[model samples]
Target: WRALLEAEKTLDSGVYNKHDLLIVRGQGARVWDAEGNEYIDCVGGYGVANLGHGNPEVVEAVKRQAETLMAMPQTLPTPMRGEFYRTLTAILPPELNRVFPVNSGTEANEAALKFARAHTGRKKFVAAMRGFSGRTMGSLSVTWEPKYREPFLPLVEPVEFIPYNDVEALKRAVDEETAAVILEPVQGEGGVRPATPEFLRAAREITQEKGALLILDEIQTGMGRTGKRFAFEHFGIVPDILTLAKALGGGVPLGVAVMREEVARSMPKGGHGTTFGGNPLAMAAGVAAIRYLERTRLWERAAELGPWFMEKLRAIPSPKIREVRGMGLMVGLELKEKAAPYIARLEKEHRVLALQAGPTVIRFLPPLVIEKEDLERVVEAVRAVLA
Candidate 1:
């Protein structure tokens, strides 16, 4: 483990704020480090392991597809890609029938932004303050965090930042010049904040009346993370362009920008493409993953377990706790102090790996398949750490 860590430090860029633990194996909701120490993985690969780590269905599908055919251009379709598309579209809202596959969340947002511009022939955009779309140029331009955008200055211009869940701000910011209003139904990276139903509905109505599109970046909140297959469903509003990643490929690196047919038609044939967007391996994995999620109706499990988990955390009786909030399994415990130390203690002392949404919020994106006992253990661990 030491040698591997040293090698990574020597060879790779220091872009990630890495942990000391070296994970070598994972199954269901648990991961084993190099020394065979086990930890409940509440982080869940940053919310990509909704079906759980080393999912047998996903593994078998990927293995079979690897042996058959791994890569092919989207121009020449494969049966695997076709099956994947059919499976994915079956679950999506009927209007969002077109998909532009990509390699990551950032790429999905990037493609959606391009499609919005091309569809509306507009140059401006409106995004929520503290809303996180992705980290690419176009996505980063809409992301509200200053630190993430400052290093890469001069991003896409004319993007207006409005306070999330403020209906008046949304109404005031969106205009005819705005190509789209990109937002998260539930702000995942921004302290796990969920949008008000009124705000979301207003965004939809405003965008529609102003001749602009609405792009919902559900990269973190989608795939049953927030109890619904898509968080937008909770708000009773459908976006024109919806971006999905994270759990979409069942732990594989895949993303898709799903759009309404009209938005799809605006982009010319060669306007956008990717080398590994619809590769067979990811497609097969996605097909299997979505099938498994649908078969089990895992989103319902998230809906059932999420509020219970948050209630347990709220019952911890800690003065440090400011609030416990989230939708479904995407829970957060906001502390009066920085969350870094508590999260570190949760991992090192209690064998519970968690994540931070920001400076003070401890974000828990446990797998939907996690056992109730495991979450109870996490609650105890969090209580001990807070103590």
Candidate 2:
């Protein structure tokens, strides 16, 4: 473990904040460190393991595809790619029929931005304050965090930031010059704040009136995380362009920008593309993952268990606790103090792994397949640590 950690620290660029634990393997909602210490994984790979770690169906699909064909450009159609498209679109709303495959959430958002600009022939964009799209140049320009944006000055231009869930602010911001309004159904990195239904509905109505597309970034909320197939389903609204990633490939890296046919057709033939966008291996994995999610209806599991879990956390009885908020399994425990030390203690003393949203909020994105007993133990751990 020491050797592996030292090697990574030496070789990799210093971008990610370092965690002392060295994770070696995972299954379901559990993981093992390099030293063979077991842990209940509430982090869930930052919302990438909705189907759970090492899902058998996805693993087998990836194995078979790896043997047959691993690499293929989007220029040529492949059977697995077509299968993935059919599988994904079957679950999505009927209007979102077109898919633009990419390899990560950032890439998916980047493509959505381009599509919006091309379809609307407009330059300006509207994004929510405390919203996180992704870290790429175009997506970063719309992201609201100052620390993440200020370092890279002069990002993509003409982006306006408005207070989240403020209908009046949204009304004042979007105009004919706006190409799209990008928002997360639930703000994952900004302390797990879910958008109000009225605000989401207003965004749909206002964007439509101004001839601007609504772009929903579901990178962290989609695929059963929010007890729904998609978070937008809860609000009764559909985006002109939707970005999905994280769990779409069942732990394999995959992302896509799903759009309406008209919006997709608006772009030129060679307007945007990715070399590894539609690779067959990830497609095969996606097919298995989506089918399993459909058959199991894992979103329903989140719907039932998430509230129970949040209630348990809320009952912890700690003065440091500020609030408990979230939808489904994408829950957060906001503290009156910095969450870093408690997070470290949860892993070190209690054998539970979690993440932090911003600085004071302890985020829990456990796998949808997590057992009830495990969650009970997690609650006990949090209670003990904060007590």
Candidate 3:
């Protein structure tokens, strides 16, 4: 605690939310604090531990890449980079074979916006209210919450915000002037709300009819967080562009902007590029992580357990709970009052860590490797606090 506080004096201004408990180590679904107190990690570092922490394959890959070649610009074609793309492309929709790797989700969204504008030759974009893209300038512009966008006015112009899961609102929002209609397949920061199937289909149809591309931000819901490899699969709709991050780098910083062949072909050479986006270290880790997830069929665990987990959360008898909603392992309990106190109690007293989607929603993103008993323990803790 002292080390963290001392560094706060000189480091850039930021806080790790409101807690002081410093996480020291992690393995599988559990983590240890600086005081050596073990806790079941439901936050999963904001859904980055899909393959679990300290995954042996990913760890070995990172170590080997660091020793062999840590940084190699994308200017030159490296074998590791080529292999990583080959592995990733097969996982994506056959039409979205093109991928532009970046350093984070924010960069991926930024690139998506540029690609959309380039493809459609339009300036406006239709986004959803209560949706989150990222904090970067381009991504923040489309984010609906006022606090994130208030200070940064005059953002990427001509962006519109509409209600989520409302097909009519979505239909009315997109037009010929719109470059793209971007949305989260399953809204993460916007209270852990999953988009309705009809809504997704409507968005897809409207974008196609209006000559605008549909972009899916799968940073939180992709890579098996939502039962399926991609949440769009649930609705049977294909997006022209998709943004991926979080678990894409096996807990390291990596992001990808994938699009249809035609959309990708629109961009001329030197349209967009990034340093450290596809470095050998992140590429190697991504390769190992993707291979591990596929080899072990980790997504199936989430597919089988996510509904059961949600059922348990909904069974808790708490007047405070307004609703329990989610798909796969991404569950949320929307409370009637502020969620901070419950989060504090869950951490300080129950030794279980979770996240808040806003002021009222408790979002749980446990690792796919988490067992049934550990999840039951989390439910028990939740019941004790809210029931």
The C-alpha TM-scores of every prediction are 0.99, 0.99, 0.97
CA lDDT, candidate 1, residue 220: 91
Residue 150's lDDT within candidate 3 is 94
Runs of candidate 3 with Cα error greater than 4 angstroms are: 5-12
- Residue pairs in collision within model 1: none
Ranking by TM-score: 2, 1, 3
lDDT assessment of candidate 1: 0.92
CA-only RMSD, every prediction? 0.9, 0.7, 1.3
Q: Please, what is the whole-model Cα lDDT of each candidate in the order they appear? A: 0.92, 0.94, 0.90
In terms of TM-score, how similar is model 2 to the real structure? Answer: 0.99
User: Model 2, clash count?
Assistant: 0
lDDT of 3 by residue, 269-305 (tens): 9888998888899999999989998898788889988
lDDT of 1 by residue, 238-353 (tens): 89999999899998899999999999999988999999999888998889989999998899989999999999999998999999999999998999999999999998999999
lDDT of 2 by residue, 70-120 (tens): 898888899999999999999998999999999999999999999999999
